[model samples]
Target: MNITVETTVAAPVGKVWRAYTTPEDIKQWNAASDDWHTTAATVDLREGGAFSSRMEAKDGSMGFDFAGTYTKVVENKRIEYAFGDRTAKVEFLEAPQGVTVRVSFVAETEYPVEQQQQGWQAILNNFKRHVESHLEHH
Candidate 1:
């Protein structure tokens, strides 16, 4: 199964792309909620390069690494990666508001698709806010 989530940011595509690909920016914006955040992030930005985000609960209760290797990379256009046996892609389209970011990934067995959808949707919203306003939760 596949699931997709998306959002638009009121910022230039370059700005949106940079925030999405940059490690420092990911650490700031890659959270589903205020209680969780990406404590660290690393990116290679090219096909065959690896990327990972260390996400953690603010209270130090739990964490996981969202790690993957790039299978395809298009500047300011798209990104495709593989994690385990699953694959995901990100699409960037210019819109009136700015850029629309779409994340489509293979569904997993451990959770309901709706739950995963909501999580990605919320995380995309955080990315949108970060690109448009430069604000983040602490």
Candidate 2:
């Protein structure tokens, strides 16, 4: 199965791209819930380069490292990466309303499709919130 989720942020494409690609920004908005947070993020941001984000529960009960290697990267436009046997693509589309960030990924059979979609959507929503919140200041 494949799952896709998206969110639009009211910011310029440059700002949105930076927030998506920068490790500092990823660390700030990579969680699906308030109880979970990304402790660290590392990004090489290029073809064949590797990236990883350490996500953990606040109670220290669960944690995992999400790591992948980039297959393609088009600045301010698209990113394609591979993790294990799955592949994911992220696209930044500019529109009159805002910049829409869309993520599509291969789904693993261990989890329900709805559950995976919800989690990914929640993370994207977090990204939208983070970007809009920061927009207010700059």
Candidate 3:
């Protein structure tokens, strides 16, 4: 199954795209909950390049690395990648309202679709919050 979640960021498309691809920005916003955080992230933003983020609980109890290879990339426009047997796409649409960031990915059979959707949506929301607040400040 495929799941999707999206939100609009009131920032320039360039700023929006940079936040999604830059490792430092990814680390600041790639968590689904307050107690979880991405301790590390690396990106090679091009087709065939690999990317990864190490997500962990704040207490150091558990963590996992999400790694993937880029299959497609379009500057400030779209990105598609493959990870573990599944793939995902992220789209940035610039409009008067701002850049609308939408993420769509294949669902893993081990988890409920709704749960995955919720987790991803929460992360996306955090991304939006981070970009809007962080990019505009020191």
Candidate 4:
């Protein structure tokens, strides 16, 4: 099973990358929803380096730690990471209106693939909200 999503946001690629990778920017918009939050995000964003972040429930009920290594990085152009049972590639392109951020993930799952895809897509949507809101502030 695999999950992937793409979205366009009204911001520059550099700004979008900053929002995607920086800890300060991550804390603001790294969860699937308001009920969930990312308590911490530690990233060593480089080829062969590892990156991890903790996405937890707000009430200290449950949490999941996701860690992965950077397989490739091309500044704002693209980022590729290999994580548990899955690999994700993210690309940022400059468009006439803003940046087109495309994310594709290859996954091996025991459950239904379509079900998994929806969840991943929701996370990407959350990310869009986070980055675009930050752009409004800047």
**Quick one: best TM-score, which candidate?**
2
- Which residue pairs overlap in candidate 3's backbone? none
Q: How would the candidate models be sorted by TM-score, starting from the highest?
A: 2, 3, 1, 4
Candidate 2 lDDT, 1-138, residue by residue in tens: 889998988898888888876766765676634445537778898888999878776777889888899999887598899988889998889999889989999988888899989988987887887887787853
Q: Show the colliding residue pairs in model 4.
A: none
lDDT of prediction 2: 0.82
TM-score winner, 1 or 2? 2
lDDT of 3 by residue, 1-138 (tens): 999999988888888777876766665666634555547788888889999888777778999888999999987598899989999999888899678989999999999999999998987788787876765653
Arranged by lDDT with the best first, the candidates are 2, 3, 1, 4
RMSD of each: 3.3, 2.6, 2.8, 2.6
| Clash number for candidate 2 | 0
In model 2, where do residues sit more than 4 Å from their true spots? 30-38
Q: How does each model score on TM-score? A: 0.86, 0.88, 0.88, 0.85
Off by over 4 Å in 3: 30-38, 135-138
Q: Compute the lDDT for candidate 4.
A: 0.77
lDDT by candidate, in order shown: 0.79, 0.82, 0.82, 0.77
| Pairs clashing within candidate 1 | none
Q: What is the lDDT for 39 in model 2?
A: 71
